[PDB]
Design a binder for these strands. Structure first.
Ligand SMILES: [Mg+2]
Ligand SMILES: [Mg+2]
Length: 757
DNA sequence: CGATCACGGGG
DNA sequence: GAGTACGTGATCG
């Protein structure tokens, strides 16, 4: 009867057991299923071949792996009936061990659905959807503070504070005496970590909210717990938090709970040049949050002075993490429900994967064999594919800019023109739609797999919107608002998904055709805007920016709002143009490279700011000054003078060496590097002096004056002697400051050579 | 040139 | 864990 919050599998006597984690009227419940079997499909040249194929074996865990059962099944592949063999295996881990040995067989045409994780395969095949119902979950935010010194190995310093927050308040656990009402003083780091364990086990939250807990709080807690020889039984089955390598980074799971890391969530939802907790909190709640930096924390801890400030910082970190979690969780819960996969997985995935997860479930429901993910070569061939058929933007600084969004136009185009990989250039097709300019043909004889699903999504959203108008219950209304927004997000991701290189249902011709049909409406919007005195400053497939040159801002807003209302009255069906926002000033460099400033003075950029540790402060500071001179002062001449002054100061050795430090992490043992960059050259010298260089250590260096590649001229920041060493002014000018500002100033007709005296 | 390698968030 | 993240820009070899 309960709400499914997660699913996984355990192995018992070498056999897999599925676990379904549920919340039923406030109670945690686990259901176990020992009956679900792993499988793959094999398309054979002939039915006689099954006798050779069913006899294929592999090895795993010292035992030989066999196909347990085979079953001839009738399915659909690319809108055509197909006969494949369902090959059953005992354990999920048998699938990577045997799949290549089945694929290699001369009688095997191809294999299918050989990389779907067991718990995700279970939820699809059994028709189970997470987050259904009105079941109320409990939340706890968790955060930590540590003792850090520049360039230390990860986990060297102790955890000095652990903070948590829920509706009962925000609290701090520390092992140094601080006299504040929300601070619990314990005897040691060990006792503080054990107190966190107790809080989590006693509060028993369904959701543990963190800010970058995947890649900091939890790996750090695990490192220090290992060090101190203590366990972290945070799982509802008493298991420890589990670190999963998700790409080049990490993801942490806590069994029986939802580890909700806000960092990947917020990074997708909103646009910010830097997603610090303080920048994120202000963007959403319109309130400032003070940042207490690592060096200030270390100084207060070691000296024992100003610890009240550090404890307040730790408390506020947990407090706002709780507040942000409550804000961002409902939408992730509805997306999980819509796509039919747990929030843990859905909150950490791109919209492209959300679409694919939705499609894999619908393919099962429709008996449609899923196409395979591409191999490296295909993935690479897809990235190099050229699309025919979005001009260069207007130069200079523009005032009073309206932003219009086109994204809600594309699902309707996909549906009306039956744009799908299964309908593309079909043989013996009776009726078809021809894409303008690109000429791709889409069969009209049957609804395509993707248009069919999109149509149902848009219909469901219209029902939800109608139920919302007719509802008196504000609780149902709030919930229905989240559900209709989840459909809008998923439906507006299909256009992009067609061109997503990793997509199973990738279709270059589909994406191209949606673009070509879409363009007819964009050209109509542009002509209608220009007939109304508007100048289009920037236009791409997602939207445009426009202004009425020299008009009053309120007149621009009114005319734009009146235009959107008008055009939508002209557009058929669910084709919708949206007024996104207004900006006091802005400039446009190229496709998805631009900067704006709103009426409250907040700078908004896309594809231009360089806030990262592997760029020197002098380059990042100059870039901020250039954007401020342009957007806040409306003065490109001031911006050019700033660059010219900084470059001359660098030439005359007038810039502090501290603004010239470059930081780069060591990501593997030093011997595993194939290319030795400056930070590796610096690292190798440190290791030679006896420094324990380890992956995760961040190397700070300065590029000195001299001959050859910068690798041979980089010096460790701790070894830099201003009275002896001379930094490379030409490197900091040509490779740091000038690349940071040259893109920006190209929009104003400046080349890299005009930004020096 | 192609290949290799780094960034983000968090102390 | 029957998945891996991404997109982009600098520097090395
Ligand atoms: Mg999981
Ligand atoms: Mg903190």
């Amino acid at each position: 009867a309960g709400m499914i919050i997660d699913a996984d599998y355990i192995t018992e006597d070498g056999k897999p057991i599925i676990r379904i984690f549920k919340k039923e009227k406030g109670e945690f419940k686990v259901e176990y299923d020992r009956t679900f079997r792993p499988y793959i499909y094999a398309l054979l040249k002939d039915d006689s071949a099954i006798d050779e194929v069913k006899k294929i074996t592999a090895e795993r865990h010292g035992k030989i792996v066999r196909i347990t059962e085979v079953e001839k099944v009738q399915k659909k592949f690319l809108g055509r009936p197909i006969e494949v063999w369902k090959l059953y295996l005992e354990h999920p881990q048998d699938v990577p061990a045997i799949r290549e040995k089945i694929r290699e067989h001369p009688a095997v045409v191809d294999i299918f659905e050989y990389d779907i994780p067991f718990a995700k395969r279970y939820l699809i095949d059994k028709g189970l959807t997470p987050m259904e119902g009105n079941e109320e979950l409990t939340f706890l935010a968790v955060d930590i503070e540590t003792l850090y010194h520049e360039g230390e190995e990860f986990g060297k310093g102790p955890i000095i504070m652990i903070s948590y927050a829920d509706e009962e308040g925000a609290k701090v656990i520390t092992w140094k005496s601080i006299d504040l009402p929300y601070v619990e003083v314990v005897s040691s780091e060990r006792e503080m970590i054990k107190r966190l364990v107790k809080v989590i086990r006693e509060k028993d939250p369904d959701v543990i909210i963190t800010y970058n807990g995947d890649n900091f709080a939890f790996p750090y807690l695990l490192k220090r717990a290992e060090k101190l020889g203590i366990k972290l039984p945070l799982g509802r089955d008493n298991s420890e938090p589990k670190m999963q390598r998700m790409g080049d980074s990490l993801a942490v799971e806590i069994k029986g709970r939802i580890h909700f890391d806000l960092f990947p969530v917020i990074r997708r939802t909103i646009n910010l040049p830097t997603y610090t907790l303080e920048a994120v909190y202000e963007a959403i709640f319109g309130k400032s949050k003070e940042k207490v930096y690592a060096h200030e924390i270390a100084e207060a801890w070691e000296t024992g002075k100003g610890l009240e400030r550090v404890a307040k910082y730790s408390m506020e970190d947990a407090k706002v993490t709780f507040e942000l979690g409550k804000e961002f969780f409902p939408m992730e819960a509805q997306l999980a429900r819509l796509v039919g996969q747990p929030v843990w997985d859905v909150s950490r995935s791109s919209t492209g994967n959300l679409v694919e997860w939705f499609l894999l479930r619908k393919a099962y429901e429709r008996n449609e064999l899923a196409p395979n993910k591409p191999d490296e070569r295909e993935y690479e061939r897809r990235l190099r594919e050229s699309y025919e058929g979005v001009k260069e933007p207007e130069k200079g600084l523009w005032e009073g800019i309206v932003s219009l969004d086109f994204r809600s136009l594309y699902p309707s185009i996909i549906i009306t023109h039956n744009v799908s990989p299964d309908t593309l250039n079909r043989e013996n097709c009776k009726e078809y739609d021809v894409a303008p300019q690109v000429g791709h043909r889409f069969c009209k004889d049957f609804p395509g797999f993707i248009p069919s699903l999109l149509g149902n999504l848009l219909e469901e959203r219209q029902k939800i919107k109608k139920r919302m108008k007719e509802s008196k219950d504000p609780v149902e209304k709030k919930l229905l608002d989240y559900r209709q927004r989840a459909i809008k997000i998923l439906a507006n991701s299909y256009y992009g998904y067609y061109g997503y290189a990793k997509a199973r249902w990738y279709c270059k011709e589909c994406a191209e055709s949606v673009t070509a049909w879409g363009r007819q409406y964009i050209d109509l919007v542009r002509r209608e805007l220009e007939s109304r005195g508007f100048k289009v400053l920037y236009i791409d497939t997602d939207g445009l920016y426009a202004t009425i040159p020299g008009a009053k801002h309120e007149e621009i807003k009114e005319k734009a709002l009146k235009f959107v209302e008008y055009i939508n009255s002209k557009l058929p069906g669910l084709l919708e143009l949206e007024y996104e926002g207004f900006y006091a000033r802005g400039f446009f460099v190229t496709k998805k490279k631009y900067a704006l400033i709103d009426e409250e003075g907040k700078i908004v950029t896309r594809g231009l700011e360089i806030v990262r540790r592997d760029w020197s402060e002098i380059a990042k500071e100059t870039q901020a000054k250039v954007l401020e001179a342009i957007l806040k002062h409306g003065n490109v001449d001031e911006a050019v003078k700033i660059v010219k002054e900084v470059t001359e100061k660098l030439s005359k050795y007038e810039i502090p060496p501290e603004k010239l430090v470059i930081y780069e992490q060591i990501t593997r043992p030093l011997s595993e590097y194939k290319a030795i960059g400056p930070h590796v050259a610096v690292a190798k010298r440190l290791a030679a002096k006896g420094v324990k260089v380890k992956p995760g250590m961040v190397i700070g260096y300065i590029v000195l004056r001299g001959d050859g590649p910068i690798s041979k001229r980089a010096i460790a920041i701790e070894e830099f002697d201003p009275k002896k060493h001379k930094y490379d002014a030409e490197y900091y000018i040509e490779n740091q400051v000038l690349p940071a500002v040259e893109r920006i100033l190209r929009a104003f007709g400046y080349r890299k050579e005009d930004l020096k005296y």
